[PDB]
């Protein structure tokens with residue numbers, strides 16, 4: 001693993017910018033000398049075994065814990081590290097020696113900052129607000145994942161000062177508006193606050209501080225690899241490689257270049273973060289794609305995003321209410337609900353159609369009937385949201401992957417809530433909503449907005465049309481049931497045998513690096529949200545995304561369902577920890593799980609079968625553990641023979657753990673789950689020859705929660721698992 005290959009062909013074997021390399025060198029020798037002298041003093045004053053470190057972190061000095069592994073805990077620990085860093089700052093002016101100096105600079109900085117926290121106490125804090133100083137583990141945990149799974153598209157590390165407040169606020173205002181996270185250091189914090197721009201944790205705008213406090217963006221980043229990436233303390237290139245692929249960070253070096261800022265900017269280069277500066281640079285203080293100037297305060301931003309590789313375009317729905325995903329999961333009781341749509345109360349339905357160009361007015365929204373003001377508070381009312389779409393590269397195929405976005409789109413605005421799916425949607429709007437000026441034409445805005453934002457290469461135009469009239473809802477509730485039955489049709493018709501390509505899913509490698517899902521027609525992804533068609537549309541929409549096609553090639557076991565093609569793909573994408581995967585059994589080489597499984601299956605030899613327990617069930621199961629304890633063992637991308645994480649709908653698949661005996665093998669499941677799947681279990685049990693009433697033979701928590709309490713019931717009912725071969 002030569003991470004450095006990303007630096008090849010960077011600068012011709014001649015144009016080595018001996019300028020930049022001299023600044024970096026001097027500035028690196030400077031940062032180190034500072035750390036050395038300031039450490040020497042901490043030791044004369046506190047003693048060499050005196051403790052040192054950051055508050056609220058499990059990672060000692062993170063940058064160092066990651067790149068070389070030491071767990072700095074006391075002053076004496078910093079001595080051999082500074083010695084080593086010093087010895088690695090070399091005079092030959094190579095891009096390499098430069099990078100190595102940038103690294104020693106992050107170390108010096110990390111040490112200086114920790115040394116500085118020696119005078120910190122929660123009662124007598126050193127860098128008190130607005131600034132953050134060292135940012136704690138809890139926020140990295142909370143926003144770091146959003147960071148490495150790319151929800152937050154990129155990270156901006158701004159060091160120095162902008163040409164003027166207007167200049168700074170301009171960029172930090174849009175950069176910031178484009179959903180990014182910010183690490184600020186130095187002067188711009190001043191400039192920015194001057195202009196009353198609010199920022200901080202809740203805004204993911206980090207006023208770090210000023211000199212060596214820029215290292216606080218590095219140790220934030222590096223902790224993401226130690227926390228989420230699971231990379232062992234000290235795996236240097238693995239950590240660099242991780243920073244590069246997952247942390248979309250770049251630095252904006254605004255203002256005039258001083259040597260240490262430059263050496264630190266270079267430290268961000270050594271770990272794959274590009275530098276984009278204000279100053280116009282000569283050809284010898286520059287690097288194509290790593291250290292570059294773009295003086296027009298109208299470029300920089302767009303130019304960073306671009307050099308990093310950050311791709312995002314924004315939408316602009318001006319509304320009377322708050323908007324974003326953070327307004328999701330908001331509930332709307334009958335004691336705040338202004339109006340209520342759908343439910344088992346009024347006529348609902350939603351649909352996303354595909355139309356030609358000629359027939360659509362991009363941006364044209366329409367509410368046919370009494371809007372939100374034309375109604376009694378705590379009033380019900382029919383609705384019918386039809387999103388008609390047109391696009392060059394659009395497909396009927398993508399319709400479902402789209403429509404799915406309604407619940408999530410609709411839940412973004414504050415004062416709103418959506419539930420269910422098609423003619424089954426339960427919506428609700430809060431008094432607070434209607435209060436700030438919430439009108440039905442706005443659901444048509446939150447909507448057209450997003451669809452155009454989240455599908456920029458297949459969608460060209462979007463037109464929405466709500467429907468609170470009970471006449472119109474029942475007429476276009478039947479045209480759609482035509483779409484839904486032409487749709488839910490497509491699913492049912494697909495089988496494992498009928499296709500010769502399955503789709504992988506790497507989406508959860510953001511929190512479970514070694515986990516790889518394989519999605520096939522008859523086995524939905526364990527999160528229950530990604531079907532084979534879903535994965536297939538996503539790949540097609542994004543051939544470079546985390547959902548790739550894998551042909552069935554190299555048959556190994558036709559019964560357990562093992563193929564070399566899937567095995568190789570998994571081995572390669574699980575950091576080589578998983579070598580084999582059987583699709584139709586949980587007893588040998590079961591597929592792994594991330595942590596979002598809707599349910600857990602576990603073989604219980606005392607009953608010769610499987611218990612299944614769903615995420616929301618909280619009682620004791622016959623294995624002597626609850627869902628969350630099992631979850632701890634089953635998740636994490638590790639192979640667990642005899643346990644397996646699954647989506648609920650897989651329970652009714654004809655391929656359901658087929659090599660193990662299938663449905664007939666299940667002896668216990670929570671009553672609620674059993675009822676929630678009554679129909680599919682009844683039909684499946686019927687086809688399987690288990691009989692119309694097999695469901696009644698499956699024990700549940702009302703029968704018991706221990707194997708001794710459950711066996712009697714299975715005997716009495718003559719459960720079929722009791723007559724099958726043991727699975728051992």
Ligand code: SF4
Nearest residue numbers: 505507508517525527
């Ligand atoms: S659980 Fe599997 S299918 Fe679902 S998002 Fe995670 S990796 Fe993808």
Ligand code: NI
Nearest residue numbers: 594595596597
């Ligand atoms: Ni998961």
Ligand code: NI
Nearest residue numbers: 508527594596
């Ligand atoms: Ni998951």
